[PDB]
Structure formats: C-alpha cells, structure tokens
Design an enzyme around this catalytic site. Structure first.
Site, PDB file in Angstrom:
ATOM      1  N   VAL D  45       0.829  -1.196   0.000  1.00 22.76           N
ATOM      2  CA  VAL D  45       0.000   0.000   0.000  1.00 22.76           C
ATOM      3  C   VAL D  45       0.869   1.254   0.000  1.00 22.76           C
ATOM      4  O   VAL D  45       1.892   1.307   0.680  1.00 22.76           O
ATOM      5  CB  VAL D  45      -0.940   0.032   1.231  1.00 22.76           C
ATOM      6  CG1 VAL D  45      -1.932  -1.113   1.158  1.00 22.76           C
ATOM      7  CG2 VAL D  45      -0.154  -0.049   2.527  1.00 22.76           C
ATOM      8  N   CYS D  46       0.485   2.252  -0.789  1.00 24.06           N
ATOM      9  CA  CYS D  46       1.221   3.510  -0.817  1.00 24.06           C
ATOM     10  C   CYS D  46       1.127   4.198   0.544  1.00 24.06           C
ATOM     11  O   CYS D  46       0.031   4.404   1.067  1.00 24.06           O
ATOM     12  CB  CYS D  46       0.654   4.439  -1.892  1.00 24.06           C
ATOM     13  SG  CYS D  46       1.710   4.643  -3.345  1.00 24.06           S
ATOM     14  N   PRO D  47       2.281   4.530   1.135  1.00 24.22           N
ATOM     15  CA  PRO D  47       2.347   5.158   2.460  1.00 24.22           C
ATOM     16  C   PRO D  47       1.980   6.638   2.381  1.00 24.22           C
ATOM     17  O   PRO D  47       2.773   7.498   2.761  1.00 24.22           O
ATOM     18  CB  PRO D  47       3.824   5.002   2.838  1.00 24.22           C
ATOM     19  CG  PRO D  47       4.531   4.920   1.553  1.00 24.22           C
ATOM     20  CD  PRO D  47       3.616   4.214   0.604  1.00 24.22           C
TER      21      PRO D  47
END
Lengths: 169, 163, 163, 163, 169, 162, 169, 163, 163, 163
Positions: D45-47
C-alpha cells in the site's frame, strides 16, 4: 521410608559376573535383600569391607539373601574398579552385583544421600521376602560394617518369621 | 543462565598435574574460559574429543584461554582415568584441568544436566574475561565437538572485543 | 526447551523462491531441519553468513535437510531485503526460505529472544525426522556460524541414527 | 494508560536527518508531541499517510508541536525504507523522525499492540508540553488518519490551555 | 476492550422522539453504530457537539449508520434537557437517541469512565455491522469532536470492507 | 534427624540407681552416649538384651560412654519392672539409667515411634562428646542388638576421632 | 467432642479376668457405659477409687451399666499391676475391665490427654445405650472420684429417659 | 456501617441558595444532621416530600439540625431542577442544600445504593453532634418520608441526650 | 442484604394468646408482616411501645398485616412477662405474638444485633406478601417507634401494590 | 480452656442481695470459685438445685469458696425470678449471686454453650485461689448436681493444696 514399611523398589545397571547388566528389585522375590551403600569408587582407602561381603557371598546365598552393593557412581566406573586388582586398591573379582545410582534416586529413596556432597552415606538395609524393611544401619563415613552381624540379623528375622516370637522367662 | 548474561561461578576439586587440586573459576581472570562438558568417565568409546582439546591446549594458551573439562563423576574416578594409559582407553597425561561435579550442581547451573540419567549433555561454554557468557554449544550424546570451531569462535570474539 | 526433547513446532510467512508464502514446520517431516536465527535485516554488516548457507544449500539438500533462516522482522522487510541486490548489501537470491517471526513467538519458544531489544540471538538448531532437538548453538551477536560445522554435526547425527 | 494521565515516556533509535539517531521523549518538552503509530514498513500500500504528515510538518512546527512516527520495525528497516524512493513505494526524505520500537514496549505502553501479529494498530496520541495525554485516536488497520483533524485538535487544546 | 475486538453490548432507557424508550444495541445489527459519549447534562457550555450530530443525522442515515449519544445521567434529566430550548442552552429537538447510563456500566465497558467523578470522557466509538470495534476517539473534556471526520472514517471503513492500491513501479 | 547432624537433646524422669531421678542428656559431657530403644516394659519375653547391656555396663563405662535404655512407659512402671525379679521375667538391678518417654517426644525426635502402636522401634543411637549423631541401627521388633557390635562401633569412632 | 454429641467409639486390649483380651465399645450395646480414665499404673498412691469401682461393680451391673477403666499404659503393665496384690499397692483381682490406650488416641478423643505428659486426666464419661454422651467429669490429678455420685447420675438419666419428662411447680 | 457506629463523613458540590458551592459534613459538627436520599431529579412525580422538608426547614434549624438532600445526579442537574418552577414540576427555591453524589460513593457508604440501577433508595439518616449514627429509615422507591416523624425522632434523641 | 431483596425467613417459639407456640414466618402468607424488635425483657422502663402495638393490632388486621414482637430472650421469660400485670411493669395481655430469638440468629439476619451486649437494636421491618423487604427503620436504644407511621407506610405500600 | 489450665476470667451484671450489681471474678481472690451454669430462667420445673446451693451457701463460705450461678439470660430476667416467690416457682431470696451472660461469651469460654439454642449446659467449674481450673463437671440438661459432691471436691483440693 521406615522399618515395617514396604522398601523402595530399585533398578539400574550394575556390574554382574564381570559384565554390565540391568538388575531389578522384583527379580529377587522370595529372597531377602541386603542393600549396601558406600560413598565412592577409587578412594585411596583399601575397600576391605565390600570385598569381605563379596568373598563371603556364599553364606548369603545359602540364607536365600541377595547382597547388592550400590553407589552414586557410574556403572562404567564400577566395572573399571572391578577390573582393577585388589592389591592396587581395586575390587578384583566381585561375586556380588555393584549397582550404579548415578541418578541418585535410590540413595534419596533410602534417605542416605548427602545432597551437598553428591555421595551416599554408609547405609545398610535388610528386606524380607515380602519386600518390607526389617532393618537399617547407617554409619558415618569413617566406620565400616561387620558381615557377621548382618548374617546374625538375617538369621534372626528368618527364625522369628517361621517361629513366631517365643521363649518367655 | 543464557548468553550475554554473567556465567555462573564454579569451583571444585579437579585433577591437574596428575594430582588433585582445588580450582575456582576466578583463578582464571583476565582470560577466556572454555567449559567443556562430558557425560561419564570410563566409557568404552575412545575419548578422542577431550584428548584433542588437551593435546591442542597450546593453541588455547596462545589465545589466552583456559580450557576446563568437567563431569558429574568423582574426582577420584577422574584421577583413576588420567592414570589409565591411552592404549587402554584412558586419558594419560592431561594438560587441562578435569573437574568433578559429583554434586551435579554445575551441570545444573549450566542447564546441561539430564536429571533422569544423572549425567551432563555435551555442552560447551565460552566466557570472556569480564565473566559474561558469549557462546554455548549443546550437543546430544552421540555427537562430539570439533576443536577448530571452538578456536574460531574464541579468536572471533577476541577480534570483535578489540575492534 | 532442551536437547533430547521434541523441538517446538513453527510456522509463519517466509520468503520462498522470491515470493511471500506461508510455511509450516510439519511441512518438513522426515527431513532434518536446521533453524537459523539472525538478529536483524538491513544491518550495515555484510550478511556473508546467511548467504553462505543459501549458496551451499545443495550440500544440505543432498543430506535431506531443510535450512530455514528466521528473524523477528516482518515478511515484507524480508522480501525487500531479498529484492535488494547483494552489491547494495542485500540478500539477492535466497535458495533457502527466510521466515518472519514478527510475533517474536518463535525466538521465545527457542529461548533465543532478547526481550529488551526485540531481536533474536545468533542461534542454530538441529532437528531430526522425529522432530526432536539434537543440537543447539547460540552465539552472541558479534560472532557468526560456520557452514562446514553444521554440516559435520548433521552428518554425525545421521550416522548415529543409521547404525 | 488513559487520557488525562501523564503520557508514557518513550525513547529509542529513530531515522531523522536520513541518519539513525537516538531520540527521547523528554528532548521535546515545552512542545506538544504527536505520537503516530503505523503497522509495518514495506507494505504494498502507498504510504500516503506518513508522507502526508512529513510533508505538512511545517504546519505542526508553526504550532510548536513535534510529530513523531513510530513502528515496531528496526531502525535499519526504517533507514532502508527512507532510502527507498517514493516512486517505488518508499518514504523518500522524511522531515519527521521515524522511530523504531523493536521491543514493542512502546506500542504496548500505548495499548495499541496486536500481540498476536506483533504489529501496532493505527493509533495517534496528542501530548501537551507538560507531558500529559490529551487525545487518543485508535483506528483498525485499513483506515488512515487525517492531518487537518490532528491540527484542529492541537490548535483546540492549546487554545483550551491558554483559556 | 480494544479495537478489532467485538464491542460491548449496551441497552437502556434513552430519549427518542421526545419520549423515554428502551433501546438495545442488537436493534441495529444491519447498521454501523457511532457511540457518542459526553460528560454531563445541563453543563454551562453550549452543547454544540451533540447538536451538530443530531442536525447532521441524515448524513449518517445515508450511510446506514446509527448515531447514539450517551451519558451517565438519568433519562429524565436527558428528557428535561431535550425539552429545554437551544436558545436557553438546552438541546431542543434531538433526532438521535440520547441514552442514559446511570449504572455507569456502559461507560465502564468502553473504558471512558472517570470513576472518581462518575462522569464519562468525551469518547467516540465506531462499530461495524459485525459488532466489532473499528475506531475509538477519546478527547479530554475541553475539546469536542468533528462530525465530518466521523463520517470520513465510517465511509472509509465501509469502502474498505467491500473493497488497497499499491504504489509499486 | 539424620547422621552427622547434632542428635536431639532429651530429658525426663528415669530409674537409675534403683530410684527415680530426673535425667538430662547434658549431664553426661565428655562422654559418648548410647541411646537404647525398646518397645515395652513387662513383655513376656526374657529381657536378655537390656540385661546384657546392664551386665556389661563396665565395658561401656571404661570407654567413657553412657548407655541409656529408654521406652515410652512411665518411670513408675520402669521402677516396678526393676523391682521385679529376673526369675519372673523382670529386670532386677539395672546399672544403667532407664528413661521414661511417656510423652513419646523422644521416640519421635529419634524418629523411631510407631504412631499407630504408641511404642518405639528397636533403635540404637550413638552420640559423640560433641553431641553429633554418628550411627543409627533400627531393628523391627523380633530382632535384638548385639553388645559386641555396639562396642566395636564406639571403638571405631573414638579411634577415628583420636 | 462434647456432651449431647454421640460419644467416640473406642477399642483395644484390656485386662479381663486376669487375661489380656481385645474389647470393643460395641460389645456393650443396650447398656450404659462409664468410661473411667486414670493417669498411670504403679503409682505410689493407694488405688482406692479404682478398687472401689471394681468392688461395687455389681451395683453398676444391676443398673445395666458397664464401667471401664482405661489408661495410656501398655496392657502388659496393666496385667502386671493386676497380678500385684493390693497389700503391695497393687490392684489384685479386678472385676471391671482395664483398658490400655498406649497410642493415646482414646485419651485424645475424649480430650483428657495431657499432651505434654502423655497421660490422661482423671476423667469420667457417661454414655447411654444410644451411644450419646450425657455427662463428663474431669478432675485434676490430686483428686479422685466418688462411686455414689456416678450412680446417682446414671440412675437419673435412665429415669429421665423412662419418665417423660418434667413436672411443673 | 450500623446504628451506634460513627456515620461516614461526606462532602461534595451542592446547590445552596440557588448557587453551586462545595459543602462538607464537618461544616456542621455542632448540629445534628438529617441525610435525605432520593432516587432521581426530574421524575414525572411531583417532589412533594423534599419540598415539604425545604419549607419546614425552620423547624429543623430551631432544633439545631441540618437537613441535607442528596442524590446520584450531577450538581448541574440539581441546579436545573431548583431553577425549574414548581408548577412545571420543578423544585423552585430550596432552603436546604441539595448534594450531588454522581460518583455514587456516598450512597454506597450509607448502603442505600442500587448498584444495578445507579440510583439511591429512599433512605434517611440521623446523625448526632458526636457524628454517631442514631437512626436510619430506608423506604422502597414508591413510598416517601414524613417530616413530623423525623422531627419526633430528633426531639426524642436531643431529650434522651440531656437526661 | 437489604430492601427489595427477599426478607430473611424466621421461626421460633413465641407467646400467643398467653400461651407458647412454635411459629414460622411462612404461616403468614398473603398478609404483610411487621417484624418488631425490642432489646430486652423486664426493663424498669414502661413497655409503652409494645403495649401500644398490641392494643392497636386490629387496625393491622384490617390491613391484613401481622405485627410480631421479637427479642433475644427466652420464650419462658416472655411468658413470665406476659403473665406479669402491666402494673409493676409487665406486659399483661398481648394480642400480638411475642417471639423468642434466644439463638440470636434472627437479630443477626436482620442485622440489628449488638454482638457486645447480646441484645437487639430497636429495629422495625416491613415485609410484603411476596416476602420482599419494603421498609426498615432502626432506632438506637433510647428512642421508640410510632404506630401511626407504621400504619401509614403499610397503607402506602399496599396502595402501591394495588396501583 | 481445659482442666489444669488457668480458668477464663468473667464479669458482668449479676443480681446480688436482690439488686442488680456489677460483679467480677477477680473480686474473689484468696477464695475458690464455683461457677454454676444453668440453661434458662422461668422453667416450669421447680428450681431445686440452684436453691439448694443458695441455702447451703454457708458451708461454702466456711470453705472459703464463692459460688456463682450464671445463665445466658438478662440480669433483669434474673431480678424478676428473684422477685418471684418460691411458691410461685420463683427463686425468692438468693444468698448466692446470679450472673447474666447475655453476650453468651462466658458460656462459650467455658465451652458449655449450645450455639443452636443459645443456652448453657448444666456445667460446673471449680477454680482455685490461683485462678487455675481444678475440676469441670458437665451435665446434659435433665440432670442436676449434688451439692455434697461439689463440697467433697473443694475440700479435697484444699487438702491437697495444704499437704
């Protein structure tokens, strides 16, 4: 564990007839048992006492009693000692079994174990054919046991058992 | 008693110059200590392992480490065994101390004791000069320990310690 | 948890063949198992040790033993490290599974966990086909483990096992 | 550990100026502190969340508050992720400290630790200059936190503090 | 009682549509629930927070979520406050239920109870249709809660439940 | 109570010179002590054992050891048995003290008491001048103790000490 | 264990008719029992009380009560004392049973045992045919017990049992 | 807590003369105290009893006794009820203090608390100048207490006290 | 326990109509019960209270309630007192039962027992037909109880029961 | 609490010379005390025993012993029984003290109390000048005690004491 109480069972590797062999208390039923405790093998002191029992073993066999020497040493150390000549401080031939109590379970069951030293006291126990304890001798380390007395006590118990305690004044 | 924790002190009667003498862990301070555990004396198997350490003791002395063999047997059985020739399966001359743990207390402190059998497992321990435990090897009974590995780990720790 | 006693079962997500995958200890029954513990991923020190095992994995396979690297890090960090090239300090290809013990449960079961730091000591364990523990090595953090030794001990135990 | 009670102190190695450095809670006295918990590094998941805070750090600085990210990963994993470019899913430069809680003690003190998984829940905590806890938000893993909201609560509390 | 664990059931007399009525948590199992805690009735502070939720209740209804205000005050005191006009500092009409937790059991289950004062902290909880706790906000007494955020979190969880997006490359 | 541990102190009223007298373990310092336990007084069996010790008392005294017979019977019953002729199965004159342990405390301290029967086992204890226990023999009821053996053991310990 | 509670059973070897015989409490059912405790045998004091009971035993028998002397001495010592003539300070012939409580269990059950001394106090207990304790007298060692009183009491209880029950002023 | 035993001290914020003020039991140590417990504010039922006490307060003051109303409601709710007109079901002016036991500590000390309901029973207590409890009446919720009786009991105790 | 809880059952020998009879609480089902406690018999003080209850018993009967006087004295002492004329201090005729609680079990169940003195406090209890405790009044020894109040309370509760 | 052990002290209000008076055990030093326990007052049975002791009190005074009758009844009930003529079944005048043990503490100390009934058994105790218990007689309720016997026991003990 007291007199008139069933004696603690015991088993383990012992040196028999010059070979290591497993022995058990139930192997000798219908016969008296003499459990003989000594502190350690390869002591500088000449082991005259244990030798005395081994030599005079026939007398015990005749009384239908099995004598068993026991210590807290390994059965290998025992066998080594057996193969060491008596002149050198060894046991030489041993006509009685020498039992290893490396676990120390036995000496504790018989309450002769010095926890601090990891050695057994000089104790001796007499067990009838029913497996009950009839006699206990416990000597401090310096003092050995006389064979003649032990024989006297065994003969005594056998006599009382077959001839229920008599002779009034 | 685990690694990175101070190793349990130990003392007792040991066979050293073919004679019985009392030894203590603190006798070797400023030096690494290798505690070498073996099950029993007078086993039928040739004691190649313990002998190997004794023979190669010089390499350890050069590394400033004291090697100590220990078992749950009497110091008397130990003395008997040392005085037994190597041809008969004895230890012969031993240039390292052989320690008696008749109480079995030591084997219990290092947790290598088999309570059921009354003998110690094949455990080996490395203790720095500060007295902290840096290494423990524990082998099941059938398998022995290699000397070179022990030397490598000691050499390793010494290097890490200085750098 | 001691030697001669059945070794603790273990399972969890590990990176196998470059992918995250759930693995379980019982998947490898009938094979020896070598449980390899290391403190942390992405340490500045070049991971020569783990790589050495991975490279020489074939030698272990000929002996029918499964080597498993394990740490207290997430399987994602593991995967990242695997996907990091060796020139960069990464693991590159790993021919052995690298297992995540984020829970720290495993390191605690094998008693190699440093509670204060949340990391595992450099411990190594050998497990027979029966699942019993035959060997344990535990090193303080600075000192690594030799592949040749591990192989020797495995060969030794297998030999005792066969005769 | 509940609201209106002095917030648990915390310290440890964190990634701050692209370098690992020891930080302590008491280093930031006289300033509000926002303790930001996230589950794991290197998630697919993109932080977006942590990045959002780092980028909008100046607004927090204007309020004299220190925002601190914290996770149960090693500071080395942290450094790796920071050194991972944002395009590849890394954090890139982080203008806020990223703190390692490998022991998991911190996540445990704030009661945001999932013991079973070894990871922290998405919790956020606001601590006044006196070190007392004024606000706690705890989100289950799928849902992130809004920066504007955090700013609102801090502005609000500071206002309450003066009046 | 923590997030990801099933939220504690609750029931009790609450003010709904101007009348006292028994309500139970299980009445809303097809809906998300927002449990809203406030310290006390008849506080001098204008009850802007509770009112904000009551007014924007329709927005919650669009999301199939039930908002429930709760305090440790009697339902009678609640009703009194409801019948008090907003201009006078009252709640006026309330389109969400206002629940009495006189036993203080509820406030204790959600761990927002100040035992010493007998009042609840300003805590807010989001519970999915499974009855599991997904979110908790706890504010010290001076600071209120924003409606938009609660809505954002609820929408977020519903979306996540039915439906992430790796950055990648 | 084990060997190498200081043996338990004891006191009580005993028959000694044909008269009842309070006796204590500490009265005999510089000497070994032989504590002799027997089950009961006025048993039908001829008291050959206790008598044997009484007769050969000089041998123990020459070794600076004190022999004390002890039972769980009253000192009065003891005195009665003493005043009972040997022909009737009695003890007659006793040159050693015969101690009453009616409380049974002594037999419990020496761990020879049959709680069920209220009598002591045939136990014998050897105590050095330092007061430490060096030897214990315990026989089941049918079997008596030999004097020569006790003497041998005392001789042994005294010699080792010396 | 107090009056109005079922009295403790007791058994053991007692001297009867000049011979040792095992006797039990249940042997005398349907009869009152008077349990007579005395400290020790071979006391220098002339055993006037016990002799008195043994002699006036017939009086007890007419009232269907069995009197039993008991002490903590061996049954052998008992037999010995019985065989000693009364002029010598002995008991001579005894027409009542004399019971040995060497274990001291009995004296302990009736709470007349001096633990410190291992002896019983001069206690006396009255037990009806149903086995319940109706009366207990306990005297310190210097003072003996009177027969006539015991008789008054047994006759009294038998009378109350047979004559229901009281008689108003 | 029983009759003839020292009555438990009590304190808290109460509405006095229409305003909230902190009051304590020890403020009245030279006068008798009548502790009056009631279930709830804003009951549909007209609060006739307690009002009766407020009105006939002069008789109590004349007897040098202080009557104190107490409930498990907030002092704010109390104040609201006092400020709510009697025609509408409120209390109106109250010449006796109305004490808040929101904590419920007091009702528990006086053993009149229904733990299950969070409300107080209709209990009434008479406390002498020594602070010892001389009388307790406890009524179930449906039934109220008469002023004249309480007065009888107080006169009785004062009279008993001097002769 | 207290009010709203089932009142403790009680039984014992009491003087009824000038005669001794074994009585039990369950003998009076379908009628309310008033348990009336007084300290001790043959006090020099005129027993005005108990006489008052005995005389107005019919009013209680009209309410289908049983008043029962009880003390920790023997039923014999009770009977003696009843047979003693009111002149000189006796009770004379008692139209209500007078119960002996020689055991003191009852006074302990209703928690009115003064352990130190072995006497009961001046306590009074109201029990509905269902057996639940509805009211408790407890007075210290110097002060007696008014009949009218008891009647008012019974009427109130019965009224509530019907309403 | 046994014979040969120091007897428990006792004190309390007793009827002496027809009036209630506080008496204590320590009031009688240099004298034997005979503690006489009887079940209850106002029994239908003619009180021949207690009367017998009162009448033959002179014999006790000659022996320097104080006899004290005691029961678990109030000193008031005692006073009543004393004021009841013997023809009516009362005690009439009593030249011995009659002690009230309403607390039942005494009957419990001497272990003659039937807890279930709250009455004492027919027990009698003899106490020397030293305060030690020399004799205890305990009779079940139907059977009385002979005075002459008691006298014999006291005479006996005094005799033993002097020789």
């Amino acid at each position: 564990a007291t007199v008139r109480d069933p004696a603690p069972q015991f088993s383990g590797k012992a040196v028999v007839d010059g070979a290591i062999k497993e022995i058990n208390s139930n192997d000798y039923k219908g016969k008296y048992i003499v459990l003989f405790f000594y502190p350690m093998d390869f002591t500088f002191v000449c082991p005259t006492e244990i030798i005395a029992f081994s030599d005079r073993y026939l007398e015990f066999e005749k009384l239908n009693t099995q004598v068993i020497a026991v210590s807290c040493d390994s059965e290998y150390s025992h066998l080594a000692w057996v193969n060491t000549p008596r002149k050198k401080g060894g046991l030489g031939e041993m006509k009685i079994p020498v039992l290893a109590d490396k676990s120390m379970e036995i000496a504790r069951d018989y309450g002769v174990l010095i926890e601090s030293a990891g050695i057994a006291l000089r104790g001796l126990f007499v067990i009838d054919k029913k497996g009950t304890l009839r006699h206990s001798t416990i000597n401090d380390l310096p003092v050995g046991r006389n064979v003649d007395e032990v024989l006297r006590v065994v003969e005594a118990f056998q006599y009382a058992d077959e001839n229920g305690d008599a002779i009034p004044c």
